[PDB]
Short mmCIF file of C-alpha atoms in Angstrom, two decimals:
data_model
loop_
_atom_site.label_atom_id
_atom_site.label_comp_id
_atom_site.label_asym_id
_atom_site.label_seq_id
_atom_site.Cartn_x
_atom_site.Cartn_y
_atom_site.Cartn_z
CA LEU Q 1 94.41 96.84 110.22
CA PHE Q 2 94.46 94.40 113.15
CA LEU Q 3 90.98 93.06 114.15
CA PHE Q 4 92.17 90.55 116.75
#
């Protein structure tokens, strides 16, 4: 998961 990438929560930038």
